[PDB]
Amino acid sequence: MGSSGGGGSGGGGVTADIGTGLADALTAPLDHKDKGLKSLTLEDSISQNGTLTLSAQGAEKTYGNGDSLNTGKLKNDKVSRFDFIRQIEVDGQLITLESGEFQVYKQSHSALTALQTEQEQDPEHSEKMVAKRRFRIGDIAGEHTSFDKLPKDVMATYRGTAFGSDDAGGKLTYTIDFAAKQGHGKIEHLKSPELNVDLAVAYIKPDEKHHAVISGSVLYNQDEKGSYSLGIFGEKAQEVAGSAEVETANGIHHIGLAAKQ
C-alpha cells in the first residue's frame, strides 16, 4: 500500500457524473432518432403532486399531476433516480410541500417506478413540517412471469440499483438460480458504515403472485446482519425489483432494490 497503486475513484461504479443518461430525460425530450418510445406524458401519472421539481445527475425538470416525461433515449434496462419535492398549492385547493427521492426503472416492454420521501410539512397550523423516510414503489416490472415457465437449469442473475431510508439509494448485483431457488450476490452503493456487503439469494416459483421470486440474507464480514427478499419478472432474463432488511447493532434499516436481468 505504498509502492503499488492503481485505482482512482474505484470506490464503486457510477459517480455524480458517470452515466448522466438520466440527465437527458429531464432536459432532453424526444428527438429525431428514437428507434422506440420518444416520451410519455403524465396527464394522470400523478395526482398528489400538482407540482414538484426534480433534478437528475445532469439536469432537473418540474413534474407533478398533469406533468409529462420524455425517455426516448432510455433503453431496455434504463434507470431514472433523481431528487424532487412533491408540492401542491392551488388558489383554492391542495397546499403543501414534501421532498423525497425518485426511482424509475425501464425494461423492454414494461417499466417500474418508486417514490422516496425524506422531509414533509403540514400547513394545518404549526405542523407545516415533517421528517421521515417513506418509499412508495411505482410502475410494475417488465414482465411478471412465474419462473415455472422454464424451471430446469437457468441461472437467474440480476443487478441494478436499490434505495435505503437512511443511506444513499443503493447499488447491488446478485446471481440467482431458476427453480433451484439458488442465488447469492453483494449489495453496495455509498461508503457509510455499511458501504457494501455480501448477500445470498433464492429463486422461487410463485413470486408475489406467479413470477420469479428472490430471497436471501445480507451480512458484512464485520458484524452486520441484514436480509434480502425480492421478486423478478422475466422467464429468466427480464428484471428484478424488491427490497431488503439491514440490522446493525442497535437499530434496523430497510433498503428497497430495483434491477434488471
Side-chain angles (χ1 to χ4, degrees):
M1 58 174 217
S3 297
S4 293
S9 65
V14 279
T15 189
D17 212 67
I18 264 285
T20 12
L22 316 337
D24 267 295
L26 307 82
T27 345
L30 58 146
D31 205 69
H32 257 252
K33 357 165 303 235
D34 286 300
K35 82 162 161 96
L37 41 111
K38 311 150 176 183
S39 52
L40 266 90
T41 294
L42 302 143
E43 292 170 88
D44 294 63
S45 214
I46 351 173
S47 264
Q48 59 173 111
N49 325 257
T51 57
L52 81 92
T53 273
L54 84 86
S55 184
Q57 301 189 137
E60 81 195 277
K61 154 172 268 157
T62 199
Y63 272 89
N65 198 217
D67 278 85
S68 64
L69 188 89
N70 300 85
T71 42
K73 240 180 177 182
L74 252 118
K75 261 273 206 162
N76 301 130
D77 40 297
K78 253 289 165 186
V79 210
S80 250
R81 10 75 72 77
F82 36 90
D83 191 90
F84 68 93
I85 297 155
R86 317 108 63 35
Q87 316 147 102
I88 317 76
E89 188 208 73
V90 175
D91 41 275
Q93 325 189 335
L94 267 88
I95 268 123
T96 258
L97 303 101
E98 81 198 276
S99 201
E101 225 180 291
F102 216 131
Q103 280 267 136
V104 185
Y105 245 105
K106 207 261 193 245
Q107 324 284 254
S108 176
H109 271 118
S110 242
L112 50 163
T113 301
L115 299 184
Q116 252 208 311
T117 296
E118 152 74 69
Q119 267 206 121
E120 257 149 304
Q121 293 164 201
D122 258 284
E124 298 279 270
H125 6 79
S126 220
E127 332 226 302
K128 70 276 209 134
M129 45 141 286
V130 205
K132 53 173 103 212
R133 317 130 225 219
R134 246 62 176 123
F135 82 103
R136 199 202 95 117
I137 78 75
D139 207 350
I140 64 115
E143 259 192 283
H144 329 143
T145 160
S146 234
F147 241 40
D148 195 69
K149 280 32 192 65
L150 76 123
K152 300 136 167 195
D153 199 73
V154 172
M155 244 183 290
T157 286
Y158 296 67
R159 100 290 284 222
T161 296
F163 38 110
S165 269
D166 205 70
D167 259 34
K171 253 276 294 149
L172 78 77
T173 294
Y174 311 148
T175 282
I176 323 119
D177 198 35
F178 68 102
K181 75 213 237 199
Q182 191 178 308
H184 139 115
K186 316 209 172 161
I187 133 70
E188 35 178 287
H189 203 29
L190 34 151
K191 289 261 268 175
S192 228
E194 59 169 87
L195 317 97
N196 308 155
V197 149
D198 296 274
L199 134 87
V201 192
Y203 221 108
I204 329 302
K205 268 162 262 215
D207 193 1
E208 281 201 75
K209 289 87 120 281
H210 55 273
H211 325 133
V213 215
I214 290 308
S215 294
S217 39
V218 63
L219 266 112
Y220 195 36
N221 279 298
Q222 235 244 41
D223 243 303
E224 221 161 329
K225 311 103 95 51
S227 23
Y228 245 83
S229 265
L230 282 111
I232 299 149
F233 16 104
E235 230 122 299
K236 31 138 214 222
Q238 295 312 313
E239 288 100 26
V240 66
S243 51
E245 253 219 82
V246 135
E247 224 202 69
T248 298
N250 260 268
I252 295 112
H253 324 155
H254 102 100
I255 18 71
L257 319 145
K260 58 250 175 83
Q261 324 284 310

Coordinates of all heavy atoms in Angstrom, one line a residue, residues 107-141:
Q107 N -37.8 -1.2 -18.5 CA -37.4 -2.6 -19.0 C -37.5 -2.6 -20.5 O -37.1 -1.7 -21.2 CB -38.4 -3.6 -18.4 CG -38.8 -3.1 -17.0 CD -37.7 -3.4 -16.0 OE1 -37.8 -4.4 -15.3 NE2 -36.6 -2.7 -16.1
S108 N -38.0 -3.7 -21.1 CA -38.1 -3.8 -22.6 C -39.5 -3.4 -23.1 O -39.7 -2.7 -24.0 CB -37.7 -5.2 -22.9 OG -37.9 -5.4 -24.3
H109 N -40.5 -3.9 -22.4 CA -41.9 -3.6 -22.8 C -42.6 -2.9 -21.6 O -43.6 -2.2 -21.8 CB -42.5 -5.0 -23.1 CG -42.3 -5.3 -24.6 ND1 -41.6 -6.4 -25.0 CD2 -42.7 -4.7 -25.7 CE1 -41.6 -6.4 -26.3 NE2 -42.2 -5.4 -26.8
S110 N -42.2 -3.2 -20.4 CA -42.9 -2.6 -19.2 C -41.9 -1.6 -18.5 O -41.0 -1.1 -19.1 CB -43.2 -3.7 -18.3 OG -44.7 -3.8 -18.2
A111 N -42.1 -1.4 -17.3 CA -41.2 -0.5 -16.5 C -41.6 -0.5 -15.0 O -42.6 -1.1 -14.6 CB -41.5 0.9 -17.1
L112 N -40.7 0.0 -14.2 CA -41.0 0.0 -12.7 C -40.6 1.3 -12.1 O -39.5 1.8 -12.2 CB -40.2 -1.1 -12.2 CG -38.7 -1.0 -12.6 CD1 -37.8 -1.8 -11.8 CD2 -38.6 -1.4 -14.1
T113 N -41.5 1.9 -11.3 CA -41.1 3.2 -10.7 C -41.0 3.1 -9.1 O -41.3 2.0 -8.6 CB -42.3 4.2 -11.0 OG1 -42.4 4.3 -12.4 CG2 -41.9 5.6 -10.4
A114 N -40.6 4.1 -8.5 CA -40.5 4.0 -7.0 C -40.3 5.4 -6.4 O -39.4 6.1 -6.8 CB -39.3 3.2 -6.7
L115 N -41.2 5.8 -5.5 CA -41.1 7.2 -5.0 C -40.5 7.1 -3.6 O -40.8 6.2 -2.8 CB -42.6 7.7 -4.9 CG -43.2 7.8 -6.3 CD1 -44.6 8.4 -6.2 CD2 -42.3 8.6 -7.2
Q116 N -39.6 8.1 -3.2 CA -39.0 8.1 -1.9 C -39.2 9.4 -1.2 O -39.3 10.5 -1.8 CB -37.5 7.9 -2.2 CG -37.1 6.5 -1.8 CD -35.6 6.5 -1.4 OE1 -34.8 7.0 -2.1 NE2 -35.2 6.0 -0.2
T117 N -39.3 9.4 0.1 CA -39.6 10.7 0.8 C -38.5 11.0 1.9 O -37.8 10.1 2.3 CB -41.0 10.5 1.5 OG1 -42.0 10.4 0.5 CG2 -41.3 11.8 2.4
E118 N -38.3 12.2 2.3 CA -37.3 12.5 3.3 C -37.8 13.6 4.2 O -37.4 13.7 5.4 CB -36.1 12.9 2.5 CG -35.2 13.9 3.3 CD -34.5 13.1 4.4 OE1 -33.6 12.3 4.1 OE2 -34.8 13.3 5.6
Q119 N -38.5 14.6 3.7 CA -39.0 15.7 4.5 C -40.4 16.1 4.1 O -40.7 16.1 2.9 CB -38.0 16.8 4.3 CG -36.9 16.8 5.3 CD -36.3 18.2 5.5 OE1 -36.3 18.7 6.6 NE2 -35.7 18.8 4.5
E120 N -41.2 16.5 5.0 CA -42.6 17.0 4.6 C -43.0 18.1 5.5 O -42.3 18.6 6.3 CB -43.5 15.7 4.9 CG -43.8 15.1 3.6 CD -44.0 13.5 3.8 OE1 -43.0 13.0 4.3 OE2 -45.0 13.0 3.4
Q121 N -44.2 18.6 5.3 CA -44.7 19.8 6.1 C -46.3 19.7 6.2 O -46.9 19.3 5.3 CB -44.3 21.0 5.3 CG -42.8 21.1 5.4 CD -42.3 22.1 4.3 OE1 -41.2 22.1 3.9 NE2 -43.2 23.0 3.8
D122 N -46.8 20.2 7.3 CA -48.3 20.1 7.4 C -48.9 21.5 7.7 O -48.8 22.0 8.8 CB -48.7 19.2 8.5 CG -49.1 17.8 7.9 OD1 -50.2 17.7 7.4 OD2 -48.3 16.9 7.9
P123 N -49.4 22.2 6.7 CA -50.0 23.5 6.9 C -51.3 23.5 7.6 O -52.3 24.1 7.1 CB -50.1 24.0 5.4 CG -50.3 22.8 4.6 CD -49.5 21.7 5.3
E124 N -51.4 22.8 8.7 CA -52.7 22.8 9.4 C -52.7 23.9 10.4 O -53.7 24.5 10.8 CB -52.7 21.4 10.1 CG -52.7 20.3 9.1 CD -54.1 20.1 8.5 OE1 -54.8 19.3 9.1 OE2 -54.4 20.8 7.5
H125 N -51.5 24.3 10.9 CA -51.4 25.4 11.9 C -49.9 25.6 12.1 O -49.2 26.4 11.7 CB -52.1 25.0 13.1 CG -52.6 23.6 13.0 ND1 -51.8 22.5 13.2 CD2 -53.9 23.1 12.7 CE1 -52.6 21.4 13.0 NE2 -53.8 21.7 12.7
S126 N -49.4 24.7 12.9 CA -47.9 24.7 13.2 C -47.3 23.3 12.8 O -46.2 23.0 13.3 CB -47.9 24.9 14.8 OG -46.8 25.8 15.1
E127 N -48.0 22.6 12.0 CA -47.5 21.3 11.6 C -46.9 21.3 10.1 O -46.5 20.3 9.6 CB -48.7 20.3 11.6 CG -49.7 20.8 12.6 CD -50.1 19.7 13.5 OE1 -50.7 18.7 12.9 OE2 -50.0 19.7 14.7
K128 N -46.8 22.5 9.6 CA -46.2 22.7 8.2 C -44.8 22.1 8.1 O -44.0 22.7 7.4 CB -46.2 24.2 7.9 CG -45.2 24.9 8.8 CD -45.8 25.1 10.2 CE -45.1 26.4 10.8 NZ -46.2 27.2 11.3
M129 N -44.5 21.1 8.8 CA -43.1 20.5 8.8 C -43.2 19.0 9.2 O -43.9 18.6 10.1 CB -42.3 21.3 9.8 CG -43.1 21.5 11.1 SD -42.0 21.4 12.5 CE -41.8 19.6 12.4
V130 N -42.4 18.2 8.6 CA -42.4 16.7 8.9 C -41.0 16.1 8.6 O -40.2 16.7 7.9 CB -43.5 16.1 8.0 CG1 -44.0 14.8 8.7 CG2 -44.6 17.1 7.9
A131 N -40.8 14.9 9.1 CA -39.5 14.3 8.8 C -39.6 12.8 8.9 O -40.1 12.2 9.9 CB -38.5 14.8 9.9
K132 N -39.2 12.1 7.8 CA -39.3 10.6 7.9 C -39.0 10.0 6.5 O -38.9 10.7 5.5 CB -40.8 10.3 8.2 CG -41.7 11.1 7.2 CD -43.2 10.7 7.4 CE -43.9 11.7 8.2 NZ -44.9 11.0 9.0
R133 N -38.7 8.7 6.4 CA -38.3 8.1 5.1 C -39.5 7.3 4.6 O -39.8 6.2 5.1 CB -37.1 7.2 5.4 CG -36.2 8.0 6.3 CD -35.8 7.1 7.5 NE -35.9 8.0 8.7 CZ -35.1 7.9 9.7 NH1 -34.5 6.7 10.0 NH2 -34.7 9.0 10.4
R134 N -40.2 7.7 3.6 CA -41.3 6.9 3.0 C -41.0 6.6 1.6 O -41.0 7.4 0.7 CB -42.5 7.9 3.1 CG -43.5 7.3 4.1 CD -42.9 7.2 5.5 NE -44.0 6.7 6.4 CZ -43.8 5.6 7.1 NH1 -43.1 4.6 6.6 NH2 -44.3 5.5 8.3
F135 N -40.8 5.3 1.3 CA -40.5 4.9 -0.1 C -41.7 4.2 -0.7 O -42.1 3.1 -0.3 CB -39.3 4.0 -0.1 CG -39.8 2.6 0.3 CD1 -39.8 1.6 -0.7 CD2 -40.1 2.3 1.6 CE1 -40.3 0.3 -0.3 CE2 -40.5 1.0 2.0 CZ -40.6 0.0 1.0
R136 N -42.4 4.8 -1.7 CA -43.6 4.1 -2.3 C -43.2 3.6 -3.7 O -43.1 4.3 -4.6 CB -44.7 5.2 -2.4 CG -46.1 4.5 -2.5 CD -47.0 5.5 -3.1 NE -47.0 5.2 -4.6 CZ -48.1 4.8 -5.2 NH1 -48.5 3.5 -5.1 NH2 -48.8 5.6 -6.0
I137 N -43.1 2.3 -3.8 CA -42.7 1.7 -5.2 C -43.7 2.3 -6.3 O -44.8 2.7 -6.0 CB -42.9 0.2 -5.0 CG1 -44.4 -0.1 -5.1 CG2 -42.4 -0.2 -3.7 CD1 -44.9 0.0 -6.5
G138 N -43.3 2.2 -7.5 CA -44.1 2.8 -8.6 C -44.2 1.8 -9.7 O -43.9 0.6 -9.5
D139 N -44.5 2.2 -10.9 CA -44.6 1.3 -12.1 C -44.2 -0.2 -11.8 O -43.3 -0.5 -11.2 CB -43.6 1.9 -13.1 CG -44.1 1.5 -14.5 OD1 -45.0 0.7 -14.7 OD2 -43.5 2.1 -15.5
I140 N -45.1 -1.1 -12.3 CA -44.8 -2.5 -12.0 C -43.4 -2.9 -12.6 O -42.5 -2.1 -12.7 CB -45.9 -3.2 -12.8 CG1 -45.8 -2.9 -14.3 CG2 -47.3 -2.7 -12.3 CD1 -45.4 -4.2 -15.0
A141 N -43.3 -4.1 -13.0 CA -42.0 -4.6 -13.5 C -42.1 -4.8 -15.0 O -43.1 -4.5 -15.6 CB -41.7 -5.9 -12.8

